[PDB]
Amino acid sequence: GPHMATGQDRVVALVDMDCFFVQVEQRQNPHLRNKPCAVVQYKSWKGGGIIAVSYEARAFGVTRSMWADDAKKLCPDLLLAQVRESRGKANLTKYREASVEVMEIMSRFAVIERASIDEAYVDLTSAVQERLQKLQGQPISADLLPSTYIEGLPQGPEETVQKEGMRKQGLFQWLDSLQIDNLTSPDLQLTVGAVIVEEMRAAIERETGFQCSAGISHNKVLAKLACGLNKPNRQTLVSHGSVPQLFSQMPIRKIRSLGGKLGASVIEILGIEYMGELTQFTESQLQSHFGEKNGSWLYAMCRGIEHDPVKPRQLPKTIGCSKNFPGKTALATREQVQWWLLQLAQELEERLTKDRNDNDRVATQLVVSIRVQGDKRLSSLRRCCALTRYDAHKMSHDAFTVIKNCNTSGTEWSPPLTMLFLCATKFSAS
């Protein structure tokens, strides 16, 4: 009892931007603000593919992966913004630069781990300790947490007919219970972490004009889950004590890393649907079905416990460019293949050169991946070679050299390629 770890050692948050690519386009074009809007790529086929959707547009049922022509059927007044196109492919530079704006603000507060173009984990354990020392015995006011939800509250016994009324009542219950006394209560630490995350979210909105949501908990999985509970423009605190009720009706697929085959297996092999049901199995039983690492992870995670560290990494480990060639457009000639490789290499060269100037590093390996027609896998084949010069002509020529014997017969290229992907990796200081 006295010796059972409860996974309450850290304070971790996950900050994720709300409808991020849309906000980027709305900041730039004020006519799009506060309107049902989506961002699309490649307008020629079915009006383009939607990759981001404003919350006003979601209310009509518009979603990612939907065709714009189809989205317009659900939402006639839907406004659209097109992703920039360069060299015949989508160019996501505008969103990467916007991402940098936000990541640089978050880094001021604590160590972060970039997790995607629009989210990062934050390890607030040290910052909370410092803040706790800064205010001795200072009780925490509700005004310090104007956009925070406490998951699981309010509980027990009219302002609650509306959502802000629920939020405030739950926050009051939580704050009324908190003992400022006792610098080591995990609940107190989370609360101070939440205050700091309000400050962080305020700074991002002030300095970039972008709104975001956040989750604060004791580990990355719970912080990520918490982030999505009250999006948009709100933050949610998930305490250790909230986990049994929260996990009791939480579908297994909603937990990070369980959204694929492993999660399906868990459900299928154990005959359960919710994360909390995992507690009735022993660690050995879970290890026997899903392996040593997965079994141990599951046994601790269904109890709200996870030890994956927030890595101190702001910069991407790899830099890559890819393009799909669906259906009839699959590449069928040598020349075609070489031209598209050159286009990808030119974009890559730009991004690498910038990376070298900004971050004092150079990539040393080039990985080329291709997908052949009829193959469902992301990558049909991967090959690599040395990246010794940031030269687009050398890179595209070397990439062709490494995959040219994949061609069964021809001038002609077969089987046709439905994807080309160039990735620069193995960075070293410069």
Added chain:
DNA sequence: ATTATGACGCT
């Protein structure tokens, strides 16, 4: 014809 592209585990 659900795209562009990341991190990282397994062998």
Added chain:
DNA sequence: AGCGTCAT
């Protein structure tokens, strides 16, 4: 080294 999974 090369492939498979899970992810936004």
